[model samples]
Target: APPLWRPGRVLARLREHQPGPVHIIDPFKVPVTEAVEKAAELTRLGFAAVLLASTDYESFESHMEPYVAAVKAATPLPVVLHFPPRPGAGFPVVRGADALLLPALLGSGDDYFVWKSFLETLAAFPGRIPREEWPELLLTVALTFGEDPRTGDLLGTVPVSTASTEEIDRYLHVARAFGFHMVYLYSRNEHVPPEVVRHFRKGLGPDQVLFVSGNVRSGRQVTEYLDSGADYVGFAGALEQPDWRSALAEIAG
Candidate 1:
């Protein structure tokens, strides 16, 4: 039998920070075995919690749970099950998640419905498990926005992110009104700048705001983003390097 690893401080902090809703940037999509192998490498490099990014909604539950459970059993880090803006899916497996990463914005009609239903379901099932059983299961709502070249507007721009205090406040107000515990400002076509993060912290306070970035290539970049008031940062292709352990150590430093 293969040796199984146990939880340690690194994984603990990983869970504590709740690093993502990492996007699945790999089109080829590494298999479960490879992912587990990569996780072993991460565990060795002192990483605990990892967001198992997924693509389609239909296979999300099936695709994530087994791998997550395997990773958890092998190593102590809490695993986050990433759900994209998929229509008509209810995550009864909230037990499987360390936290929830919401879609950045409601763009499509079905997305709106799905987002509403997800919230309603969570509200209904509050304490489905005792809070202590999953004390780290934080809820984060990420707003997804894109650029509309034709209209010169950010897609889903009911409230814009143009350094307008009022618009930013309204956006946060809407999220808070929906009882969202945390807000993740995600990158769409444009990179999420430090200015946006500063604005969020100024307007929403340090506790309620979280900023996540994508297309980041190195731990140095991660640190740079963190310096800009991001609560936590996520990475995709960087982990694919053969020297991933070294990368993790560098990031931890």
Candidate 2:
């Protein structure tokens, strides 16, 4: 039997504070030896979740499976897989993972089909992997030009591009209509404006998990974002900041 779903607690914590779900990201691009060391740091920081970006697709499964196992053994936090544009862009599906984040249209055009292919691949896996068996898999939908609303299609050759509000609203609506677990908005320094985040929160209710990435390096940033109405925020380059747990604890308190 699969484990019981308990993301609600974490979700609730984020809801109370932080703009959205608090997720820490780590890519599987470096050597396994180096990746292990990074995981240790994340565990030590007491992150709510760790994102493993698989840089190589051919060895995606092999590289991430063992690491997933190790992280679970090292800490009680959830481990999430983040799929890059290619084969080794995200972590492998295995036991003890709390979620998966598939990067769709991340700075390229070909990235559109990656999400579609991923869904197809998941369906091919024998014996329905119960939802609780693995962590929640989130689709990082990027707003880009030439996205089809009727079919949820992106007509771009490059993997990354900018998406409009109408496009994102349509995308999230379609995703929910199709029964996707969660959705996240990828914000760069320029793309993710406070207004966009606010509009996204207004469009998406509290039931669906929406994670915002970028500029979340301290408690003040987190507080401002939460006030803006984000479900959770992603930490991509926040190590230079103070202890995240302390920030989280402060929010919790």
Candidate 3:
């Protein structure tokens, strides 16, 4: 059976004083030998969940399956896949994963395909998934452009992401149709503004999860984001430092 998703484990901990931290890892960055152990360590460090990103589609097909299985065996944290929804990007139907986070670029003409293909591919999984065994589906409707972390310039491009707000609104509606388990907001590099986070919280009503990524390097930042209305905060390369363990403990606190 596919791993069951218990969002409440994290949601129960996410509040003004206790923020949930999601550790996002690129399999390539860590030695393959260390991944399983690190996954266990992440759980011990209080990570609400562990996310794996597929840098290239090739590796995603070959390496992702076994690695996710091994990691899943090592920890109890929810395992999520962050696969960019691009041409040739197949829907990830890996077992052992508790959730799949498919990012749909708001305007990247690709937006339409991302969600459409996501549901379509899901239905066509190698084997039928009974509703009870269905995995969590998290959607990230992100902007094509945002502030550059270093220079603070409004720049960055996904090439496939160039949709306007109205277009994005339509995209969001499509996701809502599926009752996505989570709504992801990207910080691009800067921390998402508090008001914007709260606005989304209001829109999500009472059930969906909220995930925000970027600019979370400290303990305070983690809880601050929770206070700002995020249910989960993602940590990517920010944990690559030598002091990463302490860094994570800092935020997990």
Candidate 1 C-alpha RMSD relative to the actual structure: 7.3
| Pairwise lDDT winner, candidates 1 and 3 | 3
Per-residue lDDT of model 2, residues 56-128, tens digit only: 3555456566767776675565666665443432224655566655545433444435355565545544233
Clash numbers, per candidate:
5, 30, 3
- TM per candidate comes to 0.67, 0.64, 0.74
**Per-residue lDDT of model 1, residues 156-249, tens digit only:** 2232456556656776676666555456665545556667766666666334546565556566766666676666666665666668656555
Residue 195 in candidate 2, Cα distance off native in Å: 0.9
| Per-residue alpha-carbon lDDT of candidate 3 for residues 1-253, written as tens digits (9 for 90 to 100) | 4333334333333322244778887775765556776787887777667888744455454677688788888888778777654434346566556777665544444444445656556546546446555556555554433544321211222322233345445545755675555677665545666556676676664566778877678778777778888888887766776677777777777
lDDT of 2: 0.52
Q: Show the colliding residue pairs in model 3.
A: 107-163, 108-160, 108-162
lDDT of each: 0.51, 0.52, 0.62
**Of the candidates numbered 1 and 2, which has the greater TM-score value?**
1
Q: Give the Å error, residue 220, model 1.
A: 2.8
Lowest summed lDDT over 10 consecutive residues: which window, candidate 2?
Answer: 150-159
